[PDB]
Amino acid sequence: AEEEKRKAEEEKRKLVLVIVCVALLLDNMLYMVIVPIVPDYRPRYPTESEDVKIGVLFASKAILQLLVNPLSGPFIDRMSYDVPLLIGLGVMFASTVLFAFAEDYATLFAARSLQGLGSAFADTSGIAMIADKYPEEPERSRALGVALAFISFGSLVAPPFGGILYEFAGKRVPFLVLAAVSLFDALLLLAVAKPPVGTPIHRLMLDPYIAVVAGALTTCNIPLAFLEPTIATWMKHTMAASEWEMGMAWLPAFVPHVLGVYLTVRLAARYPHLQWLYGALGLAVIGASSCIVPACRSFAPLVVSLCGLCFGIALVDTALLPTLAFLVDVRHVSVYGSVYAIADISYSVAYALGPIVAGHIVHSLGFEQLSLGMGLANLLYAPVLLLLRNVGL
Numbered sequence: 042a043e044e045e046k047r048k049a050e051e052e053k054r055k056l057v058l059v060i061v062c063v064a065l066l067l068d069n070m071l072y073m074v075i076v077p078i079v080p081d082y083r084p085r086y087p088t089e090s091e092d093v094k095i096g097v098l099f100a101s102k103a104i105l106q107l108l109v110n111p112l113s114g115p116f117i118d119r120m121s122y123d124v125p126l127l128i129g130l131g132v133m134f135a136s137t138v139l140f141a142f143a144e145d146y147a148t149l150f151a152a153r154s155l156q157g158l159g160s161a162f163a164d165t166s167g168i169a170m171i172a173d174k175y176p177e178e179p180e181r182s183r184a185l186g187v188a189l190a191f192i193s194f195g196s197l198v199a200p201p202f203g204g205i206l207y208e209f210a211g212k213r214v215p216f217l218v219l220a221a222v223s224l225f226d227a228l229l230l231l232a233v234a235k236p237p238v239g240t241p242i243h244r245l246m247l248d249p250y251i252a253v254v255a256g257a258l259t260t261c262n263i264p265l266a267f268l269e270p271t272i273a274t275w276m277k278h279t280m281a282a283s284e285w286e287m288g289m290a291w292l293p294a295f296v297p298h299v300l301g302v303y304l305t306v307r308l309a310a311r312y313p314h315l316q317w318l319y320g321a322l323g324l325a326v327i328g329a330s331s332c333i334v335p336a337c338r339s340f341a342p343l344v345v346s347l348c349g350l351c352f353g354i355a356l357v358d359t360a361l362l363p364t365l366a367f368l369v370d371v372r373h374v375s376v377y378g379s380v381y382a383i384a385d386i387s388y389s390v391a392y393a394l395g396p397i398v399a400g401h402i403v404h405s406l407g408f409e410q411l412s413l414g415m416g417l418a419n420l421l422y423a424p425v426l427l428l429l430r431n432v433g434l
């Protein structure tokens with residue numbers, strides 16, 4: 042009667058993990074489908090008409106979650122994770138039907154800002170629930186790996202099919218049925234789940250290990266903040282490939298991501314205290330790919346540079362997300378809202394700055410200077426990550 046209840050608890054953990062991963066897949070599906078659609082009002086290149094009045098609408102999501110997350114930390118610390126996860130999925134459903142319902146400028150602005158309001162609860166609550174229900178060390182990294190695999194699926198293989206299903210039927214019908222799948226997911230989490238003073242955000246940042254992880258997340262995420270709104274209009278200047286071979290450059294860069302997650306999980310189960318060197322080895326190929334992209338004149342080298350660039354983010358963001366939970370475990374009290382709020386500030390400070398200044402600094406100086414500067418930053422972020430020789434003690 043003890044093993045029976047234990048198997049029931051294992052089933053109750055797995056049926057919540059799968060539902061959280063499907064919700065994250067659908068969320069990144071939304072974030073990657075709606076990007077070519079906004080400047081309109083067979084595949085589609087991401088960005089067009091990059092100016093000051095539309096890039097601020099593309100960065101409205103990131104600037105609103107950057108403004109919300111320092112207050113949305115303690116709401117997850119005091120309360121549970123089920124309640125902010127349901128609030129995030131509810132306002133994400135409202136935003137998803139709002140994209141289908143309207144076609145103005147300010148209404149699309151409100152629909153893009155409600156996605157930031159939805160992310161700033163749902164994403165941090167999902168990663169906090171995954172880090173809560175797996176207290177032991179290898180299962181934490183394994184659940185992190187499965188979550189990153191579903192997020193990389195829903196953010197990499199989703200645009201070249203979302204565009205070609207957007208061209209045929211129109212806007213309204215696919216976003217209505219996808220919002221129906223989102224409400225079905227939220228109702229199924231309701232039917233399954235049935236719903237410590239903590240430490241403030243004012244002193245988490247002064248902890249230097251939290252600070253170096255927070256710097257590493259921004260520095261590893263910002264090349265995909267500056268290369269996504271730029272490379273599509275740059276392909277037509279050097280080689281000028283066809284439109285199928287311009288928006289599908291990030292599609293073969295998914296299998297090296299999941300193989301990189303598989304590699305660092307399987308060889309972090311062996312060595313427990315080498316995650317800092319996995320992070321440095323991830324930043325190595327991040328900097329190498331961000332240096333080697335403009336040299337790739339043909340299309341297949343420019344695909345293999347992007348698959349190296351997607352390999353590196355897999356290594357870094359699988360090596361440093363369980364490290365952050367272990368760090369807030371063995372150095373502070375065991376709460377998981379504020380430190381992943383710090384992580385989301387570190388993600389969003391790149392995405393709130395990329396699509397505003399990227400096209401203007403390409404038009405002012407050039408694309409190769411941007412690439413060499415970011416590769417210079419990722420290669421010079423080596424002595425800063427030598428501070429993590431003490432987390433195994």
Ligand SMILES: O=C(c1ccc(Br)nc1)N1CC2(CCN(C/C=C/c3ccc(Cl)cc3)CC2)c2cc(F)ccc21
Binds near residue numbers: 171262
């Ligand atoms: O395309 C985007 C994107 C999405 C939204 C917006 Br707005 N802009 C861009 N991304 C983001 C990113 C997504 C995955 N990582 C962050 C995940 C943190 C996280 C959150 C919850 C959980 Cl449970 C576990 C982990 C790193 C970055 C990524 C990796 C790739 F290999 C390729 C592309 C992308």
